[PDB]
Design a protein around this ligand. Structure first.
Ligand SMILES: Nc1ncnc2c1ncn2[C@@H]1O[C@H](COP(=O)(O)OP(=O)(O)O)[C@@H](O)[C@H]1O
Ligand SMILES: Nc1ncnc2c1ncn2[C@@H]1O[C@H](COP(=O)(O)OP(=O)(O)O)[C@@H](O)[C@H]1O
Ligand SMILES: [Mg+2]
Ligand SMILES: [Mg+2]
Lengths: 369, 142, 57, 57, 369
């Protein structure tokens, strides 16, 4: 029973090998107080982590140490590691092999130093970082297809056929989950509300969590909700106010399907995944279209499966069956697959024991994965 | 799976009830126990079930060999000159490792059900890859 | 929650109706193609008989 | 009102889904019939072309 | 009941002595994976053979170990032998005499080492390689005539009269079947499509299989299909696309009838077979013209029989009857004849028992055949 702990920027999720459900999951916020201490004897904590920190955002500043699949400001991410191991999952690492997760190709130096930091101080027995998509594939029991996890920090595609991780068509994209929230900030300024600070900026992803459904034929649905007041929806902040969101409701997620709104000049996800399809052989396209699997988070938006099916079948020749696999086990499929992989006995020989690292130097992760 | 589990646990609860109608309240602490076990099984067209039962039946023989070895060990020790080969249990351990020891045989089925697209032939392909020649007790009939 | 469920049942009904309309549209196109394919087969059998009769003579 | 309105739309979803399945089952057999009609037309073209070559010889 | 297993580069076909149909036939591809392994626990097979290998060309490289009737890279051709014996036909060679096949004169060292490899490891009881054409002759029940098998790897003619294999006029030619495919690659680049890789290069022979009919008066038919759009044909790859082939359809096989396209400066097959006719006596030409038999593969192209008849009757004096024997049992006539030959009881004494090889050394095949 080793361990499995996701790295992804949004929600550091911790659990045990084999178990079908992460034992503890919490947002990866790291907080610091932004005002002087006034009631002597508080015994203030000098930093806060996770849902404890999220509890009292009122006097807190929020640093996400994980942006775009790059681990920045390593001090706080180490703090998150420390809080995870001891408080959430509650075992010393000294007696548990550990496995982490990592986006396709983020930088070179990232793993090459992260293995060191988590392998020298925490003094873990053994570790092996596994690229996200291949793990996601395991999680669904399909050993052939294209993965689109789009974990909040980064979105990417891989072609995987008959269990081969065909590298060169890996098509990464930085259309992250958080940036939908950030754009929603700018679109919500227009209806007259304002969300300047950081705490409210955290709230808005929550308000995004429920009220963002992507709709087919964006033009017609847009003019539809413009003409009729049918879908005018309401919601309340933990303030007392109630906020009325109009067509922003379905103008949020469509930044995914076209980035012209956010500005980035890189085609929407459907065109990228079709691209990565068309950058393989003329025989692998027979099956690839059939096993398309969503994964990660940021795809729990209702409808996105169907809209995706429409766009692809329009793009691909209308002689293939594009039936896409979108189980509702999403947002965790990363972790399920990770646990299953840690459960494979043949997998035991793979990862790196302390001896190899000590006698070989840090590069062992890249050299042996 | 649910049906199997509910039936088995039903059976064990009936065992509890049989204890209930036979309950006692005297100071009973030292027992001499009779156990009935399935016999060694060798016949035609033997699937998993036979493997399980045979493994269970032979582990008790492992127990026997170690036990008689212990007693004869001390007895010959009183007449101590030299013992042939300690731990008669090695004779069975040579196949116990093959059946159970991690990534042996039984472990391979555990791993194979988990692994995606469970296909029968790939199971035997993996076994032949992993324990032929490498294991001196895993061979093929003709 | 009832209002949210009512939106999901409306969306469900609307998307399955849209799929059913696309199936109906494709079904008529397949029947148009089916008539062409049968007419080409009958024409080829007629044209074969002309050449085959002349070949015997 | 919200639970009553949801009940109407899920009932409408169910009957339109039943029609959509009927259309799919009819569409798939018409697709097989179209493929069969194309194959007999293509085989009939080959039969016509072979006798046309043989006549000239 | 000994065995019969064809050697020919295209389709290694296996069956049993006497049986009228090869029990199993499969393309002779040998495949290796050309990418790293990504989903741990696949238990990857280190090499693949036959239609199993053809199944997953997507991540595979294809080596044909048999080119121009010469067996190269013997390691994989031995692999094909091994796969044949055990998996397709499914009997240990230890209890079955075996017969192979071989093009007229390929090299000297080929047989002299192939007998060794198949006779020392497989430990077969007895073997005898028989030149292709004489075997093709028996297959059709005509014991007099000229054979033009043109098995995909090599094309050749023999004169055989009254059951005598008249050697000196054997007129081999390396206008192989595969090279029609390879030229079709270059001709199909022009219509705008592209087939660079190896997998697509395998596909194209399939697309050649249906859409290549040779036509009389090549000039007039060429200008005909140029002026009119009558024969513009369509076809689809297992990709979704549909491809439209114009006059390339009947410009493919004509590389056989004249090699100026492929470049090789050796006359087309009709002139070679007429040549080999005119290099015998002035009395054998009476019958030879009458029993002309096609054989092998690569002659299932429709029309080729008739075009051949026209060319020969033009070349030969217009007082002979050139009625050529082209049964539709082609592409297998090799194997049918082989089985019949293995069925001949008088033939039992011919082939080589282990004693002779052991006591005589490898040359026994050449010395005794
Ligand atoms: N109700 C919801 N609907 C849609 N998306 C949501 C909802 N709740 C959270 N999310 C998104 O899921 C994201 C988490 O995805 P991510 O962190 O990329 O994967 P992981 O948590 O496995 O690392 C959050 O950033 C958030 O934007
Ligand atoms: N439909 C087809 N029409 C014409 N030729 C074909 C067709 N299918 C396959 N062939 C040719 O037949 C060849 C096999 O011939 P060959 O290997 O020389 O004989 P053998 O298979 O007996 O050794 C293949 O290379 C292929 O080019
Ligand atoms: Mg996360
Ligand atoms: Mg062949």
């Amino acid at each position: 029973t080793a361990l499995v702990c996701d790295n992804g920027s949004g929600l550091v999720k911790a659990g045990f090998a084999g178990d079908d459900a992460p034992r503890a999951v919490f947002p990866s916020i790291v907080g610091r107080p932004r005002h002087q201490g006034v009631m002597v004897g508080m015994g203030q904590k000098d930093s806060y982590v996770g849902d404890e920190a999220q509890s009292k955002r009122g006097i807190l500043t929020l640093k996400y140490p994980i942006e775009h699949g790059i681990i920045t400001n390593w001090d706080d991410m180490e703090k998150i590691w420390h809080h995870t191991f001891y408080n959430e999952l509650r075992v010393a690492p000294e007696e548990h092999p550990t496995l982490l997760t990592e986006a396709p190709l983020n930088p070179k130096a990232n793993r090459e130093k992260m293995t060191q930091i988590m392998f020298e101080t925490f003094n873990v027995p053994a570790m092996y970082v596994a690229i996200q998509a291949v793990l996601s594939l395991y999680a669904s029991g399909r050993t052939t297809g294209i993965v689109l996890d789009s974990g909040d920090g980064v979105t990417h595609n891989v072609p995987i056929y008959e269990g081969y991780a065909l590298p060169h068509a890996i098509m990464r994209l930085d259309l992250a989950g958080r940036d939908l929230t950030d754009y929603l900030m700018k679109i919500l300024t227009e209806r007259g509300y304002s969300f300047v600070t950081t705490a409210e900026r955290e709230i808005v992803r929550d308000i995004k969590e429920k009220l963002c459904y992507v709709a087919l034929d964006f033009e017609n649905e847009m003019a539809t909700a413009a003409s009729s007041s049918s879908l005018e929806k309401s919601y309340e902040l933990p303030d007392g106010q109630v906020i009325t969101i109009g067509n922003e409701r379905f103008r949020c997620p469509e930044t995914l399907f076209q980035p012209s709104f956010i500005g980035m000049e890189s085609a929407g996800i459907h065109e990228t995944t079709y691209n990565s399809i068309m950058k393989c052989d003329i025989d692998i396209r027979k099956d690839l279209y059939a096993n398309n699997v969503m994964s990660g988070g940021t795809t729990m938006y209702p409808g996105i499966a169907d809209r995706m099916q429409k766009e692809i079948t329009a793009l691909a020749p209308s002689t293939m069956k594009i039936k896409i696999i979108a189980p509702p086990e999403r947002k965790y499929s990363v972790w399920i697959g990770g646990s299953i992989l840690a459960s494979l006995s043949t997998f035991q020989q793979m990862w790196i024991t302390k001896q190899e690292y000590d006698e070989a130097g840090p590069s062992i992760v890249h050299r042996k994965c | 799976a649910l049906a199997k589990a509910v039936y088995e646990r039903m059976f064990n609860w009936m065992v509890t009830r049989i204890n209930a109608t036979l309950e006692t309240k005297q100071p009973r602490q030292y027992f001499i126990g009779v156990l009935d076990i399935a016999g060694f099984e060798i016949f035609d067209f033997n699937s998993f079930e036979q493997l399980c039962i045979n493994f269970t039946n032979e582990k008790l023989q492992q127990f026997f060999n170690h036990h008689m070895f212990v007693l004869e060990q001390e007895e010959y020790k009183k007449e101590g000159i030299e013992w042939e080969f300690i731990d008669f249990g090695m004779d069975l351990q040579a196949c116990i490792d093959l059946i159970e020891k991690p990534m042996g045989i039984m472990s391979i089925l555990e791993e194979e059900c988990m692994f995606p697209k469970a296909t029968d032939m790939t199971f035997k392909a993996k076994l032949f890859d992993n324990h032929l020649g490498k294991s001196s007790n895993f061979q093929k009939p003709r | 929650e009832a209002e949210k469920a009512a939106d999901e049942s409306e969306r469900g009904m609307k998307v399955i109706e849209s799929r059913a309309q696309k199936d109906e549209e494709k079904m008529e196109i397949q029947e148009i193609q089916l008539k062409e394919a049968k007419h080409i087969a009958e024409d080829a059998d007629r044209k074969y008989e002309e050449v085959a009769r002349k070949l015997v003579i």
